[PDB]
Amino acid sequence: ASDMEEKFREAFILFSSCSDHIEMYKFFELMNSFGIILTNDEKAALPNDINMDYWLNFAKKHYNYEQPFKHINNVNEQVQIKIDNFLGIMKALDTRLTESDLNILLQITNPENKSTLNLKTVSQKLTESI
């Protein structure tokens, strides 16, 4: 079964500030927080004024129920990165995450002080914290 509508709905209003419409930039964040990635051409074909019901229908169709965070780490393939390297990549790609948010991530996904972060463990921890 595994119905996701109550979580899809709460996330929408979290990114839309409780309005039934969400701006396009905020919509990209919303869908990304469920592992959903669109191409540029798919992005172009979206409505310009995305409302709750559109998202609830889009999420049902695009969300990966078996592997929510497949784009962090794909189980259907045959992964690790040094911490300061991983942080550097976040900063290079200009992340909205403050210095504290990064620290919660790092102790969540990596409890020890290993010099190196398992991307499969990140997708594991984030699937739990949905």
């Binding site: 990635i37 962090i72 976040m90 909205r96």
Partner: protein, 808 residues
């Protein structure tokens, strides 16, 4: 409250610089691309809003954008703007996550306004634009200046993990003072109501907080007691400020490295004497008058024969009570502060005798008889002179008897009623001003170091540039002061950057400097200046405002900085100040400049038997008219001394902003705020910091930040860190003009740094999806967390809803 003048001038400050990149390679609009625009019915209908947020619509052409407004909420209607009316947007950026405006990717005007607005609305009113600090009046107690917050800002280990604050400025100034044995000045400026007085008072309280004790507590107490006293005698309720400082204040302080004021000095200049005689409707005179009449006990009333606040010619009877001001409680505090300044009980009685005498002199009526005192007021005149310890007969003679020099003989005549009223008023203003200056002089003899200041903390609190449509002599003096301080500001910015370049072997040829010495000359130069021809016309036997204007117009044809006015060219002229052209009206310039008590009345006062009154004009020279008798001549002397002192210190600038003219918290008036950003050189400070090689990080920081530009070059054990950076920059695509290698730091132009960022992002294209999903998932979690904080409150709303449902 937004006038059309403000909308007009605000619109001239607006400039389009960077261009919008709304289209991709293929020519299609980026889905959801947001811009700022100044074209919107919202703006037509609400003069508080200068810019709105839109998204460019799919199908837009390059020559003409089609947008839909999204913030504030609109209709969903598409409309067309020319690209020169579109500014870039800092979408997806937390304004509370860093404190300098310069760290935004786009620093255009609507971006700057929005960054400060959203900080202002979350009660973070301090933002830096290095080296300037920006402070927006919240018009309420934020609660972030308590003793607990002083201790927190003083005692936190690393100064940089606290948000910007006035305490951060105090802490840095005192740290540099004790770190390198260098004097500092903290210059607080801005317009009436911008919070200058509170900033100054908060910084003094920081300075007065010591880790463990101040054995010089006696002197710090006298210095902290100067605030109530200086406000009672120098502050007044105006239309726009219930507590406006009507004098310029400069202080020098000696402060232990762990807090605690050990010595001080106080300087007050350009007191608004005219306020002693008349006030506009809904304005008061200086607080002390109302504090004294309302607060004096019955014995004090008996003593000086005091009447009610409404019963005095010098005090506006319709405006004697101010909402939210307890003049009686303020008198109790002023009396305690005077005692804390080590004035005796009899010093204090003399001080209030003189105030009572000034007020009583204002009640004396003159008549045309020649002039004479009304017989009904012969006793009132006598009591007023006894209260000021002056000779009533001799004071009378100087007010009613005139001595002219005709040919070369003295001739005794009579002042008429008007001229005799001018004399009486001048005595009231002069006694009040010298009493105010005497209190400061007395305080200084208790708090100053005997040998003068070796190393000191200076503190200046002044109006910034003031621009009305009709600007008088008072605005000219203010605006001359702020030209000197502008030179201080661009001098320090240039000296600091030039030293950094020279310390790293970078060339300083491409450094920029916008000197304002030419406008300082046209205003101040000894031979050929406005202030010179003002002085000349004042000493001239038949000088006039119009003649003064004429001498300027014919002798200053040698710089742009003086521009003869268009309409009513006589009695009007324009100066090309650093912030733009300002129009002045020469009416009463000579009157105002000569408003200094001179002549025999001064010698009568110096022959008072009372030693305090002897000291009011002590040392002052007898008076033809001399330049020591002109406000403008004496002020340029003061101002030059003051600036020579400040110029020898490391300066700190706090620029105070008034966000609306209603004294309302959380109300944002974009046109007024934009006009102040321009006047306080905040926009200039952003430009200045981006010029030349504005990015400077050390080899190890440059390598950590730009590692993935050329990961092979950066992860090479064979080459040193200096050469690694060279290899990165040589292979990255940057032109050699966009970077220089220093002794220890990589120097990048702003443009080169943004290209280097975009080149590194292209190398990390395969992390885009992964980093987007990690970021977003945590963003969701932080949003729910922010919601979880408030659920206890929401449970109360839901509980009271279910209650109301039962009641139905």
């Amino acid at each position: 409250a937004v006038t059309n003048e403000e909308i007009k001038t605000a619109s001239k400050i607006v400039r389009r610089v960077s261009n919008v990149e709304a289209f991709d390679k293929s020519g299609s609009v980026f889905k959801g691309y947001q811009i700022w625009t100044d074209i919107s019915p919202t703006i037509e209908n609400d003069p508080n809003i200068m810019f709105v947020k839109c998204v460019v619509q799919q199908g837009s052409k390059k020559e003409k954008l089609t947008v839909v407004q999204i913030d504030p909420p609109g209709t969903g209607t598409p409309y067309d703007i020319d690209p020169t009316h579109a500014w870039n947007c800092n979408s997806q950026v937390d304004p509370m996550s860093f404190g300098d405006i310069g760290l935004l990717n786009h620093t255009n005007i609507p971006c700057v306004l929005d960054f400060l607005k959203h900080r202002y609305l979350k009660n973070q009113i301090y933002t830096t634009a290095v080296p300037l600090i920006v402070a927006i009046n919240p018009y309420k107690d934020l609660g972030n200046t308590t003793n607990e917050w002083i201790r927190r800002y003083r005692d936190t280990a690393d100064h940089t993990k606290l948000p910007p604050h006035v305490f951060t400025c105090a802490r840095e100034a005192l740290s540099n003072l004790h770190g390198v044995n260098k004097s500092q000045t903290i210059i607080v400026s801005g317009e009436s109501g911008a919070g200058k007085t509170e900033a100054t008072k908060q910084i003094m309280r920081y300075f007065a907080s010591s880790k463990s004790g101040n054995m010089d507590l006696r002197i710090q107490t006298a210095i902290m007691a100067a605030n109530p006293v200086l406000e009672a005698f120098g502050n007044a309720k105006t239309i726009r400020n219930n507590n406006s400082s009507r004098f310029g204040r400069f202080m020098q302080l000696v402060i232990s490295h762990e807090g605690g004021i050990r010595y001080g000095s106080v300087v007050a200049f350009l007191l608004e004497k005219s306020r002693i005689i008349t006030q506009d409707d809904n304005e008061r005179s200086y607080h002390i008058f109302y504090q004294f009449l309302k607060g004096a006990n019955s014995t004090m009333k008996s003593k000086f024969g005091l009447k009610g606040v409404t019963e005095y010619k010098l005090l506006n009877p319709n405006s004697t009570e101010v909402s939210g001001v307890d003049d009686v409680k303020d008198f109790e505090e002023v009396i305690e502060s005077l005692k804390n300044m080590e004035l005796s009980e009899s010093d204090i009685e003399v001080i209030f005798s003189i105030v009572a005498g000034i007020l009583t002199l204002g009640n004396v009526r003159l008549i045309e008889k020649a002039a004479a005192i009304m017989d009904e007021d012969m006793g009132v005149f006598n009591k007023a002179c006894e209260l000021m310890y002056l000779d009533p007969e001799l004071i009378k003679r100087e007010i009613l008897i005139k001595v002219t020099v005709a040919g070369g003989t003295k001739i005794e005549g009579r002042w008429n009623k008007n001229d005799a009223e001018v004399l009486k008023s001048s005595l009231c203003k002069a006694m009040y001003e010298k009493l105010f200056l005497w209190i400061i002089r007395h305080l200084n003899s208790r708090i100053e170091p005997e040998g003068g200041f070796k190393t000191f903390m200076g503190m200046l609190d002044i109006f910034g540039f003031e621009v009305f449509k009709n600007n008088s002599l008072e605005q000219l003096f203010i605006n001359i002061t702020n030209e000197m301080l502008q030179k201080n500001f661009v001098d320090i910015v240039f000296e600091r950057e030039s030293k950094l370049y020279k310390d790293e072997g970078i060339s300083t040829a491409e450094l920029k400097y916008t000197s304002n010495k030419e406008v300082i000359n046209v205003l101040c130069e000894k031979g050929k200046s406005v202030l010179s021809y003002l002085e000349d016309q004042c000493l001239a036997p038949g000088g006039t405002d119009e003649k003064f204007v004429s001498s300027c117009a014919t002798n200053l044809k040698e710089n742009n900085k003086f521009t003869p006015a268009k309409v009513a060219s006589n009695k009007n002229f324009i100066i090309q100040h650093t912030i733009g052209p300002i129009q002045y009206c020469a009416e009463s310039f000579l009157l105002k400049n000569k408003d200094v008590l001179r002549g025999d009345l001064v010698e009568v006062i110096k022959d008072s038997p009372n030693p305090i009154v002897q000291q009011l004009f002590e040392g002052q020279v007898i008076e033809k008219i001399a330049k020591g008798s002109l406000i403008g001549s004496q002020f340029l002397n003061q101002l030059t001394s003051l600036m020579n002192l400040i110029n020898s210190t490391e300066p700190h600038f706090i620029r105070c902003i008034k966000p609306n003219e209603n004294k309302k918290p959380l109300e944002w008036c974009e046109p007024k705020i934009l006009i102040q950003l321009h006047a306080l050189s905040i926009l200039e400070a952003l430009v200045l910091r981006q010029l030349g090689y504005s990015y400077r990080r050390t080899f190890e920081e440059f390598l950590y930040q730009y590692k993935f530009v050329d990961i092979a070059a950066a992860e090479d054990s064979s080459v040193e860190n200096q050469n690694k950076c060279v290899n990165i920059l040589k292979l990255s695509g940057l032109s050699e003009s966009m970077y220089k290698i220093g002794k220890s730091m990589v120097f990048l132009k702003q443009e080169g740094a943004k290209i280097l960022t975009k080149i590194q992002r292209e190398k990390l294209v395969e992390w885009e999806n992964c980093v987007s999903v990690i970021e977003a998932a945590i963003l969701k979690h932080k949003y729910k967390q922010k919601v979880n904080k408030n659920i206890p409150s929401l449970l109360r709303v839901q509980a009271h809803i279910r209650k109301k449902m039962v009641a139905q």
